[PDB]
Amino acid sequence: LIPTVIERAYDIYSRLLKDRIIMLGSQIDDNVANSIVSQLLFLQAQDSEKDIYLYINSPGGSVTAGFAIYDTIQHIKPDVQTICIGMAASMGSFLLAAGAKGKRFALPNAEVMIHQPLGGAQGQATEIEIAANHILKTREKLNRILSERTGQSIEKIQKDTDRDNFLTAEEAKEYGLIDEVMVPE
Amino acid sequence: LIPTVIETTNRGERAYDIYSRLLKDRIIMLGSQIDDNVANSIVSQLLFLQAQDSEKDIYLYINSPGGSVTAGFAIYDTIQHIKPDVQTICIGMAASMGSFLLAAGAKGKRFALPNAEVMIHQPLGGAQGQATEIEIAANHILKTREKLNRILSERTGQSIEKIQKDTDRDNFLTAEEAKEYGLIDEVMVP
Amino acid sequence: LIPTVIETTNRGERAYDIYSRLLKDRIIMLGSQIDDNVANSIVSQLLFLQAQDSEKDIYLYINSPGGSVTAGFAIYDTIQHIKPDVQTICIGMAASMGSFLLAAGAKGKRFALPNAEVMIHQPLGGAQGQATEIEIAANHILKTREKLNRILSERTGQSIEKIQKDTDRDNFLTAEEAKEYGLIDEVMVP
Amino acid sequence: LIPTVIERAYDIYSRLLKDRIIMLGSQIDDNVANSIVSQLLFLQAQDSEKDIYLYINSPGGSVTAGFAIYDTIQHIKPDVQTICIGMAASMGSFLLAAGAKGKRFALPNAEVMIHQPLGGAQGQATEIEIAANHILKTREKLNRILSERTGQSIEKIQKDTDRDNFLTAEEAKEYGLIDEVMVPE
Amino acid sequence: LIPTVIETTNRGERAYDIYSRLLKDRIIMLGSQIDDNVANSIVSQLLFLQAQDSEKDIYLYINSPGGSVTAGFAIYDTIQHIKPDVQTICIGMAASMGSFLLAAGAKGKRFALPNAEVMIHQPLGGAQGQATEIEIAANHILKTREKLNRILSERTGQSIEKIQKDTDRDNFLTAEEAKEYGLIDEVMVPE
Amino acid sequence: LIPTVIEAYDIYSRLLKDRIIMLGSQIDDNVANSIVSQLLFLQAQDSEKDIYLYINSPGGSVTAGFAIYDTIQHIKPDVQTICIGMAASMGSFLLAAGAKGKRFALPNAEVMIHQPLGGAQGQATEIEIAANHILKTREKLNRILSERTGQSIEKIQKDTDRDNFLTAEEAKEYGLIDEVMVPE
Amino acid sequence: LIPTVIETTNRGERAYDIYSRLLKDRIIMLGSQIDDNVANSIVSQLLFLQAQDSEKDIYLYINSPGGSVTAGFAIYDTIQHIKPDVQTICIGMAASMGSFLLAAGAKGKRFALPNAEVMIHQPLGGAQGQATEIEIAANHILKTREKLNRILSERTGQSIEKIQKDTDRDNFLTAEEAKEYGLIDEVMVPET
Amino acid sequence: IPTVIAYDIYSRLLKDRIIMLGSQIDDNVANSIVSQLLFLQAQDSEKDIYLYINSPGGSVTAGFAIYDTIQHIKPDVQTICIGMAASMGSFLLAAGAKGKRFALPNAEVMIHQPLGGAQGQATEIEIAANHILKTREKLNRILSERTGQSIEKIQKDTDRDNFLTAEEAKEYGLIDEVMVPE
Amino acid sequence: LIPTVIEAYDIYSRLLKDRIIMLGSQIDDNVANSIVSQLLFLQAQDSEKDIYLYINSPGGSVTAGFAIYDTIQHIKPDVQTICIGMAASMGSFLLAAGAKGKRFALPNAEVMIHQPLGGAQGQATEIEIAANHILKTREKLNRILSERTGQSIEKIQKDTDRDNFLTAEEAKEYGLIDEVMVPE
Ligand SMILES: CC[C@H](C)[C@H]1C(=O)N(Cc2cccc3ccccc23)C[C@@H]2N(C(=O)NCCCC(F)(F)F)CCC(=O)N12
Ligand SMILES: CC[C@H](C)[C@H]1C(=O)N(Cc2cccc3ccccc23)C[C@@H]2N(C(=O)NCCCC(F)(F)F)CCC(=O)N12
Ligand SMILES: CC[C@H](C)[C@H]1C(=O)N(Cc2cccc3ccccc23)C[C@@H]2N(C(=O)NCCCC(F)(F)F)CCC(=O)N12
Ligand SMILES: CC[C@H](C)[C@H]1C(=O)N(Cc2cccc3ccccc23)C[C@@H]2N(C(=O)NCCCC(F)(F)F)CCC(=O)N12
Ligand SMILES: CC[C@H](C)[C@H]1C(=O)N(Cc2cccc3ccccc23)C[C@@H]2N(C(=O)NCCCC(F)(F)F)CCC(=O)N12
Ligand SMILES: CC[C@H](C)[C@H]1C(=O)N(Cc2cccc3ccccc23)C[C@@H]2N(C(=O)NCCCC(F)(F)F)CCC(=O)N12
Ligand SMILES: CC[C@H](C)[C@H]1C(=O)N(Cc2cccc3ccccc23)C[C@@H]2N(C(=O)NCCCC(F)(F)F)CCC(=O)N12
Ligand SMILES: CC[C@H](C)[C@H]1C(=O)N(Cc2cccc3ccccc23)C[C@@H]2N(C(=O)NCCCC(F)(F)F)CCC(=O)N12
Ligand SMILES: CC[C@H](C)[C@H]1C(=O)N(Cc2cccc3ccccc23)C[C@@H]2N(C(=O)NCCCC(F)(F)F)CCC(=O)N12
Ligand SMILES: [Mg+2]
Ligand SMILES: [Mg+2]
Ligand SMILES: [Mg+2]
Ligand SMILES: [Mg+2]
Ligand SMILES: [Mg+2]
Ligand SMILES: [Mg+2]
Ligand SMILES: [Mg+2]
Ligand SMILES: [Mg+2]
């Protein structure tokens, strides 16, 4: 049950969108990506100069869906701020790190997790090889961009994402995944 | 079936579902298990209410068995970030992350009704796979408990040691006991 | 399929689902098993009706087999907190936490229709795990029963000892027997 | 798919309710009872003197839910006519018999069935005893009211409801469950 | 996996599964939930043993949560019918119809080991359908309870009223408490 | 789920107002019918202005894909194609089907090409019919892909034998798209 | 698939499944979760062994995660009732009621092999229904715990209080730690 | 299972002191193998026993039942890997009498860290984590002793699934020799 | 229902008395353990007389197959292989592993060769380990098949890329068997 606000009637999320706030509040799949991409394109058309605010409370999900959002963020004119509230894990933390430089935030008790991509492969040896080569290339792609966005080496990113790596908001700032911990007003 | 209320309000007539009507008077309902959807909604409502009026109190109704710790912390951090005081009112039950959020309301403005139940306990989780994966999961949930216990100590005035001991198992408190503990400030009487 | 009713005003025809139409005249329907969703809705309706008119009676219709004790206490405490008298009217059945809420209506304004069924019994629950966990769960449900019995004693005029004995097993009462017991004040005749 | 009628757009059932017609067209549960009770209360408030029409096409259902409807019918001022179309069985036929005296009808090919209440009990001997005593008292309550409404003895009602007893509309009139078979006009 | 024991006898070597070996020595194992299969087996063993020797004691081991009342009464009536004394020995647990059968052993020869658990409670059942069917089922289980209580009164020396009250809910007894109650005669102490 | 914008439109309907169609899911008949209807509507609205087909899709039904393909080729306006996230299978086929010079992908978008998938069960002659059908369908797909990319049918056959993942730049090199759309 | 062993006797050639062969030399295998079937079998074997020889030691092998408390007490009481000493030997694991039985072996004849795992914890159970039914179930499991702890105190030399504290949660012990605790007498070291 | 004349084939092999570990290791398998070892010892305390290993591993405690019984008894227990030894299976392969641990040339040996699970309260998860970590240390220490490799190296090499050929297993010290065709 | 013969033997045990082993099912560890035990037993009984391995099998576990393979090569006696019905996958591998000159198939027996099948799930590095493992296993299989057939590793790789069904005569031509056993 999503509440409605009247001032024109808006569901609460649509009301936030009126003030250029986009909610990434779920597992990332193609539906979520298509919606966020559409919202980004709409907000750019509305105003190419004003900041956009991407709220992130997400365990991650599809890498290609994540890259749909990533590429649209980088394509458009306006700065897209990222703010981690609750959790950003996996492709969620990747998108957190993808916000406009100097405008990537987390609230003090927000959790950030980084790890290597997950997948599956079944069938013939050559099919397994193709799937393995694909996920390994995808991992190099992710690591390269994360290196660029954080200032950490690809070597360090590889090592630090080998297993689940949980970071506090302050640790995420130290790592270069965010720029600042947003403290209470 | 959520009922609708219709008001003839000077500039015309407006129809509200009952929860949206409560939101018009700065009342947010945390009335279910805490997951990311619930957290996203409450966070959005908090941000909206601050924008509407940065000074007037917000009222967070809590009837919840708790749920996701990270989802709970989304709500917690948004409460602490915004300018307005967020009152918390426990009606029915606040358990687990629900009682954590009850304790997170503005100092002096945390309430429970007389027969409301408050329960505190340690976080729950799971881990499967390799020994090193189990270790990572264990270290994570232990650090999460320390985080929770530290904040609860700050909010209640109880020591971290006492919080640890009192949350080892399920600990059910009456509204009055929750006040004594420092989880709330007052039992709201008729 | 819930029917819609349309009433013609000067600024248009206002359309109501039948339950929302009843709410316009301060009638709240407790017509299902009591869970947190039902409790949150009823609590919200009570708060809304008080704000709308702090003096006029509210009418709580009860056709319910009961359900969650904490959800029931959410409704109970909200009834006792608000200014207006909340009349209770049992139609069909009030069982368990449903009969508790029937007995919780404003003194002199608790009713049942002549063929309505009222049932009282002890709380139901479950516990699994370690011996100390079972002990905690047992102590909790026993304390919950004491609370329920104490309040029922206050509301009915019966002794706690009698309430304990009469709720040991399922105890079915006619409307007239419920009046004799003190669970209601009057059998509403045609 | 329930059709809409425009004169005020109404779903067909809401349109019938505008002319004081209530549809009991399903198995009787608490939801159905709450709705019918609310409709009865609303119609009384609208006009305390004009007849209400209760359409009955129902296999019956919950006895307590049925008694919610029954007591509300008897409580309110207006006469509630009952009209059996298709079938009235069990608590459905009980409610058919509960309509205003002289205003209980069935169409010629409508089926009326009467039988004893159904239930269940599991657990300890004393629990089974409580459940048995409860359903037996419920049966006595039903039979007593049916006797009053039909003019048949409690003894006869007991015997005739021991097993499933199917009646034609004409037989239901003879029995005293209805007053008239509504013939074509 | 039930182990086998092999003995050299006078007429050759003989192989027994462990339970069949115990039966050779007039020991019957009631070691499971009581259903008709269990009852038929125990009844057959009792009849066989009685034929083997109408005089020598039989030993009924009881580690059972109870079960079917009629199946229990098959065992009960066969015990009472046959000539030999049937000793009863509770090891682990006797609950419900299991404790009834424990109490049904030969007077003076009903035992429990010190940490054995004895539980008594009222019969359990179910009924669904028409009101008159529910009435028949209720009357049946109530009459069955009386029958059980009457016999338990006779075997324990407790009043029917006390039995009724003490079996209203689950009533767990230690071996010593079961002796005090009259369900057994002695707590068998270590030799 | 889907936010509303007021200037009231759901976000996707708002994009459709500016001639943007979203192919953002697995391709089935429902998706195809919707996209076909949108294409026909946009042509009727303006026969000369470009249409923009967003593609984030793992592919799906070949016949549903061909419903979209044929409608694109039938209508007057140029249909630009833009791969964002992923285009796989029939999704990449449709990406390659956009107006010549107006097929794009964003830099980190993934393009995958492979042979059609299917099933057959029953009698030997039924299996033969199903096999002949899917083989003819593959030839149809390969022929069109050859025409659209400039690659030989022989090369297409070889390169689609197994799953073949391409970067946006590789897709441009292959002739599946015309340009990698760089940040503005 | 349980293998068979054949030994040639004087009055013929005799075949045993491997477990039955071990039983011939007074070895009983508690090698599974403890339920009533397992208890009934072990009780029968103990009675049989006692009858066969009231004086020679019996060897109870324990590789078990535990299980039913009442089934465990069937085995426990039979061990204490019979004449012969019952040695206990933990190989692999003894947990819960399994450890309880390990500790119940003849004094001085309770063993574990060096890498065997011993676990102690409080009893587990369930209860559902009316408040008074839950109370009865709670009182029952609590009394059962007290019974277990009292006997464990007697068998180990540890106080009931220490046992209560050390069984509050899962407590894993090495064979050497189990000896130190008093659950066993000796760690059986490899032979010459 | 075929019969030879009467013995089932496995019981016939047991007559010549051959024990088959040919399945996933659970308590039933461990109890059987332990019983066979004890029996063979009683039959002859001096003659070698032959433990065939074609197993994906399984329960660590069940594996240790077999391990401790092997080390307790007098006779040397040869180990022979045929097909596969993985996990606790390779642990037992390495546990055979020194100089008498073998694999056939195409046999596969796999080593990795123990697997497990934990659910419930934070303190319960901590207990479970500490338990599996201790268990890993126990396994690694013994493997170090049996192979001559350092505990540090074992830890590194078992972090993920590590597949070895028979020759590589010999090089590692898990076996002594690759048994070549007669 | 396996019939009994009295001269008492179940039919398969009777065949084993004459040094005939039946590989008549999917290859798993149980099947491998049984066949290994039978091979060891027979050798003990007579180190010089031929053993006959009947193969009617769709294949199965590669490691289980290698248990049988290595035991065949280890023991002294020649192990003849005879394909009746079908030998597929690891089944055809074992058919090819029989004593040189003593590998047979009946005229209508079917022989199928293909690459190994498997699965992998989890982290990228776990998928890599699983991929490297199955690829090394394939190389091992291909190398041995090359040695046993006289075909090049390159040809084996190409011919096992997909399911490759061969007649008994084609299997002889390939070098998987030595002779097609004709009616006597
Ligand atoms: C030159 C601008 C972009 C690059 C170009 C174009 O490539 N696409 C394809 C496209 C489709 C969908 C998502 C995309 C995300 C990133 C990049 C391209 C995307 C649509 C866009 N349009 C708008 O934005 N129109 C303004 C209204 C927008 C609103 F959302 F409000 F409808 C239509 C006019 C047009 O030329 N382009
Ligand atoms: C107080 C947050 C700061 C000032 C900042 C910013 O960080 N975020 C990111 C954000 C996104 C989502 C949830 C957040 C919760 C806590 C903190 C930040 C959150 C959006 C916010 N905006 C509004 O609130 N705009 C007024 C309209 C608000 C309404 F809800 F009504 F739409 C847009 C203008 C802006 O600078 N910020
Ligand atoms: C009468 C003072 C109550 C005690 C106080 C307060 O504690 N709460 C928290 C609360 C939240 C939810 C349910 C509650 C039930 C019982 C008691 C408190 C409850 C909300 C309430 N508000 C209203 O009722 N506003 C009038 C409009 C109400 C309407 F429903 F129409 F929106 C907001 C202003 C306020 O100070 N309080
Ligand atoms: C003297 C009328 C009854 C006795 C009395 C009262 O007891 N109840 C409780 C009640 C609640 C629900 C169902 C009931 C069925 C039968 C009897 C009582 C029922 C509500 C009713 N109300 C209306 O009918 N108001 C007119 C508007 C009604 C409309 F439906 F249109 F909203 C509110 C004013 C009031 O005093 N009472
Ligand atoms: C005391 C039983 C009476 C005298 C009688 C008789 O009623 N029944 C029926 C019967 C059947 C089954 C169970 C019974 C249990 C209790 C009572 C009767 C039962 C069989 C019995 N027989 C034996 O016991 N024969 C000796 C051999 C017995 C052995 F078990 F070893 F086979 C056959 C000769 C005979 O007259 N009766
Ligand atoms: C393309 C037009 C063709 C030649 C012709 C015709 O074949 N079809 C069948 C048809 C049906 C459905 C999808 C189709 C897709 C591609 C081709 C044909 C399709 C309908 C169309 N109409 C419109 O487009 N009318 C303008 C309004 C359109 C709007 F979408 F806005 F409603 C009706 C007048 C008419 O002659 N034709
Ligand atoms: C020490 C047991 C006492 C003396 C006594 C007795 O109480 N029970 C009941 C009983 C039944 C089942 C399990 C029991 C476990 C512990 C204690 C008693 C148990 C049977 C036993 N019998 C034997 O052991 N007979 C020797 C043969 C034994 C063999 F196993 F081989 F068959 C029959 C002769 C007898 O008097 N008693
Ligand atoms: C002094 C030897 C050992 C130390 C001692 C003892 O501790 N156990 C317990 C035990 C039980 C089960 C498995 C065990 C594995 C390893 C170590 C001990 C095990 C049984 C053993 N017995 C035999 O082996 N008897 C010879 C016959 C054996 C045969 F298998 F054939 F039955 C019984 C005589 C006895 O003193 N012991
Ligand atoms: C040629 C294997 C050598 C000589 C050696 C040895 O390594 N193993 C281990 C082993 C175990 C299981 C399967 C094996 C398969 C291939 C190779 C070794 C295998 C057992 C064998 N034995 C026999 O064969 N004994 C004769 C009786 C045989 C019979 F089957 F009939 F029981 C025991 C005496 C012995 O030294 N070895
Ligand atoms: Mg940007
Ligand atoms: Mg605040
Ligand atoms: Mg009030
Ligand atoms: Mg009336
Ligand atoms: Mg007798
Ligand atoms: Mg003893
Ligand atoms: Mg040794
Ligand atoms: Mg050979």
Residue numbers in the entry:
A (entry chain C), D (entry chain G): 3 to 9, 16 to 193
B (entry chain B), C (entry chain A): 3 to 192
E (entry chain I): 3 to 193
F (entry chain D), I (entry chain M): 3 to 9, 17 to 193
G (entry chain H): 3 to 194
H (entry chain N): 4 to 8, 17 to 193
Question: What did the publication describing this PDB structure actually write?
Answer:
ClpP is a highly conserved protease regulated by ATPases in bacteria and in mitochondria. Likewise, Homo sapiens ClpP (HsClpP), which is found in the mitochondria, is a key protease regulating mitochondrial proteins homeostasis. The dysfunction of ClpP by small molecule activators has recently been demonstrated to be a possible method of discovering antibacterial and anticancer drugs.
Incorporation with the isoleucine fragment and 4,4,4-trifluorobutyl motif into the core scaffold of ICG-001 provided a potent ClpP activator ZG180. ZG180 is more potent than ICG-001 in activating SaClpP for α-casein hydrolysis, as evidenced by a 3-fold decrease in EC50. Either ZG180/SaClpP or ZG180/HsClpP structure is a single tetradecamer composed of two stacked heptameric rings. Like the previously characterized ClpP activators, the binding of fourteen ZG180 molecules induces an open-gated state in the tetradecameric ClpP cylinders with an enlarged axis entrance pore. The apparent electron densities in the 2fo-fc and fo-fc omit maps unambiguously demonstrate ZG180 binding on the apical surface of SaClpP and HsClpP. The naphthyl motif and trifluorobutyl chain in ZG180 form hydrophobic stacking in the binding pockets of SaClpP, which contributes to the enhanced interactions. A network of hydrogen bonds between ZG180 and the side chains of D27, L49, Q52, Y61, and Q89 collectively increase the binding affinity to SaClpP. While SaClpP and HsClpP share a high similarity in the primary sequences, there is a large indole motif of W146 in HsClpP but a much smaller isopropyl side chain of I91 in SaClpP in the conserved position.
